[PDB]
Design a binder for this molecule. Structure first.
Ligand code: CAC
Ligand code: CAC
Ligand code: CAC
Ligand code: CAC
Ligand code: CAC
Ligand code: CAC
Ligand code: CA
Ligand code: CA
Ligand code: CA
Ligand code: CA
Ligand code: CA
Ligand code: CA
Ligand code: CA
Ligand code: CA
Lengths: 224, 224, 224, 224, 224, 224
């Protein structure tokens, strides 16, 4: 029950479902989520994935209480992942949003990076993909302040493709997924795969640097 | 008559002129267009190029009926190319727009990538330059859906620098070209050349990957 | 008196102060400014730097009258620099703005690149960072025309994070700086340092090309 | 008969067999060779490929008589290709050797790049992979002179891993292939695939530049 | 006693000392070794580090019996590390050798990569640094065969700078370290740091790809 | 007389001629040398350049007595430069050798990097091109020790293509130049230009980092 899954017309929707913990990613939820992404890749009945959260929060981040060296786990996918951001997407949860190919946001969406507030460095690509998707200045402002970015500003900045009234969110994400499903899937997958290969070639160096920064930070922190 | 050309105050305007075929790029029009770009480069009376289409469409893409391994042909230019997008710019036509240094759009402009609809992969840089100029999420949404991007959204996303009423389009493009012509041309050409060299260094890897993806797609398609 | 400095709650504000020369960067002001940035880095009482100009101009650029091979001098910093753009930021002054981590603009702000007007090529990163922060098309339009970009367009394009009424400018910059100061400084500095390392890895090739273009331009200019 | 093929203990040996035309790559031989590489990839009974030529020449290059825009065709492989160089490997034939993962040479081997002699630019990666595998100075010396590199110098320069007496060549290549076959194939293929991905990330930009240089050369040549 | 350490004339020598386990890197030895490298960096009495092993083996690799996700731990150093390779350097031990700035080898030295034999992928940079330091062909031959590279071939290939009689090894390494100590240390450290920054910029993308390949391999292996 | 020049059969030979100062590069000699390279590029009677020194030294480096911020000046050339290394090539002189496309060495040749001995960091590409042309380990050994590399080791390492008896040096360089002159010059220049563009794309980031390291070193040195 901590992860819901639904397959409908070649679209798999994955719903983070720990609303009482604001969909925080416990170890168990991590295992289920990343496992579900991998299963979607290998499932020949799935063309598109939608990820979302049970209201009122998209994902508050990692369950820090429960836990640190937090390795990246988002798998190589050849199928598009649409993030239907229904609420706050914070830190590790902002990183889940940044992994998506396409984002659509409820008016209730908001985005924040609290890594520096809580004294952790990112290891799931925030430091590469946030400046890539909202611009250097805004990424730096977000990360260093830990302030919320509204849905409207996220749209202005290019973080999301659309903002809809809250109750239309999953419909809006399904409509985009249906447009994709209706196109030539050999071409969709080949073109997405290529886009990922073009992007990876540009992000790889950064992701390594991010990893090494996090490691150095953790190690120096063990001067205590 | 399939390509019009006009030189006025050191600005060469090239107009795709097959309006009845929505300015689709036949083999002949390709030869004329790319040939004209090359001639503009070597013509010492030209500082700036404007490309546009006969109404109501900018360019509907390659003439697919007539035709496939479609090699890139846009030449090395040291002079700025302004695209005056007067209508729909689709697929290969969106790639012509993405090659321009600067875009200005009529309110009647719209942009779409139908490669995945029609079962072709891009070979004129769409997969590199679309995410570069409208952002990763929007590029992926466009490519995988094949949906139109409006003139206003194109402006919001950074695809175009300006949107004007339809009848002001060529005037708006000429005004920008005149501002350029009025500056130090040695500096204009040296600075543009450098901008192109800086950009090429970042896009080259991607363009190769795009080419290889297209090739692999074509070859696997010859499992039929 | 040509550079003012003030330290307050772990924020150092540096004010270019030659308003009668529109804060043009003379040799002396360059020495003071870059020297002050370096001192801020080594000063353990400073977490954040704000740069601004005495009204009504942010910085009109280098003092060209007084002067050319103008080497880059902005030092390696591990602390964030917020640019509080109070007025026109032109050419070398636009480059000072482009060096900042975060920009906030008065409604009175405007941005222009007159390098090509005045027959100089950039050597302080404009040709790398302008397309990075406002997009390729707009950067090329700005550089080749030398036209002003308004505060509102700068906000739309992602050049600045915010635009405020003129009298609120320094308050708005101090509020952002205070949010940063209130977070874990070990994390702030480590994350910023990493962001800079990720970015430098992407800009280095471009900056070298910019330098070489400027050099070739200067050398060919000595065919006179 | 223009391409021989043999499968033995999970090793596929492909022999260019037009010895009377010094194994020149006609259109037909190209189709057969590249087709055979692709079939080896998909053949689950093959772990390793050896390529070689019927004596006394490895490959004299493309059949130029018969033919120009010569697109690259070496496919994505996840299996190692050992080149057993039995004689001269010239121009397009040197490029076939440079595509191999591992080279072993007969004492009778020699290598030359005659592209500049014959007025053609490379399109099968010579200009990237020759400096990569023999060093910048030697690559430039080879390409600009068109002089032969001996087997012994090829060994000194790192172009080949070993040089054997002529009659031991295929035995030496089979021994290496047998060592590979005897290791964990899941690991062999995963590690090779990774090596290729690491290398491609470094060569892609170069290969694009090579392609564009060749194109510009061909186009300017059509000023005649 | 599992790691020996000695400081003499501003040179710290670290000796792996589990000769009965062929200096295999247990968890404890890993902690001691990487900890010692970090301490050398911060120790103001040390200019140069020499790493070596108790005879007859340099390092047989990780203690696999004892153990898998084996994260990289070699720290950022601004001081040169000379590897005095006294015997076999295998797999993880070859990676320790590949991390060194400079290698000198006993005649008794040999090098092998058994990752593919033992069904593991590298995570300490072998897949980036082996082709960098011995050339693509030889790296691929080594990795896929798991065959030993002799001291003499290692010298021919550029893996080591020198090969000495066994009893002269540490003297030869101390002589090089003494030459370094005798030069301007501010310059030595600044130049080394720069060399590392130049190299890291080229290896980072590869190291990320290596990490991701290893992860994917481990995850697929958990289909069992 | 400080620079000799000779044109013979489309080969321009430039001889550094301050043998009493071991061909040290004074300001005047720098101006003449770099000026001569530029003139060779524009001279339509020249296909190839040979650089050499009056015996017994190739180039001892910059005239340090006479002088520091030493900017790079080697121009963009589309014609090959062969370095005929007749004696010691030290520091700035090793950098002149590293700029050449092809090197041939007298038995009397030797190479050294004394930057760290004399407390200077390189600004003419040593820190990029030395590891590129002799391998990382040997470059680091050379730079940090300041020890001489013999002609024979230079040949083993790939720094030079050939080593000849002293009296045959210029004949050997002329023979290579004659082979180049005898090939299709349109192809020679196009292929060389491409090789330079492929290489520049890989070295640019490094050269920027080198420049920034040198600058930081000079600036910190002004803590005195
Ligand atoms: C350390 As994390 C998963 O919040 O980037
Ligand atoms: C194959 As096309 C010219 O539409 O990118
Ligand atoms: C030459 As400048 C400091 O205006 O980029
Ligand atoms: C044009 As060719 C196949 O000899 O590189
Ligand atoms: C997994 As390992 C430390 O042998 O590269
Ligand atoms: C500072 As220098 C010309 O010896 O690299
Ligand atoms: Ca299913
Ligand atoms: Ca943007
Ligand atoms: Ca004309
Ligand atoms: Ca203080
Ligand atoms: Ca079979
Ligand atoms: Ca080598
Ligand atoms: Ca001590
Ligand atoms: Ca002449």
């Amino acid at each position: 029950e901590i992860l819901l899954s639904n397959t409908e017309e070649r679209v798999r929707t994955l719903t983070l479902n720990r609303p009482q913990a604001r969909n925080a990613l416990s170890a168990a939820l991590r295992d289920r989520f990343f496992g579900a992404l991998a299963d979607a890749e290998t499932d020949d009945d799935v063309d598109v994935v939608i990820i979302t959260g049970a209201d009122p929060v998209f994902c508050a981040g990692l369950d820090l209480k429960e836990l640190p060296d937090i390795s990246p786990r988002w798998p190589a996918l050849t199928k598009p992942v649409i993030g239907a951001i229904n609420g706050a997407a914070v830190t590790g949860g902002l990183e889940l949003a940044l992994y998506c190919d396409i984002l659509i946001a409820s008016e209730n969406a908001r985005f924040a990076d609290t890594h520096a507030r809580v004294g952790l460095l990112p290891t799931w690509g925030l430091s590469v993909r946030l400046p890539q998707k909202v611009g250097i200045g805004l990424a730096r402002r977000m990360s260093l302040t830990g302030d919320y970015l509204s849905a409207a500003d996220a749209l202005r900045a290019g973080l999301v493709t659309e903002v809809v009234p809250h109750d239309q969110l999953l419909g809006a994400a399904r409509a985009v997924a249906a447009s994709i499903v209706g196109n030539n899937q050999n071409a969709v997958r080949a073109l997405l795969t290529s886009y990922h290969r073009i992007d990876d070639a540009q992000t790889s160096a950064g992701l390594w640097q991010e990893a090494m920064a996090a490691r150095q930070f953790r190690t120096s922190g063990d001067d205590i």
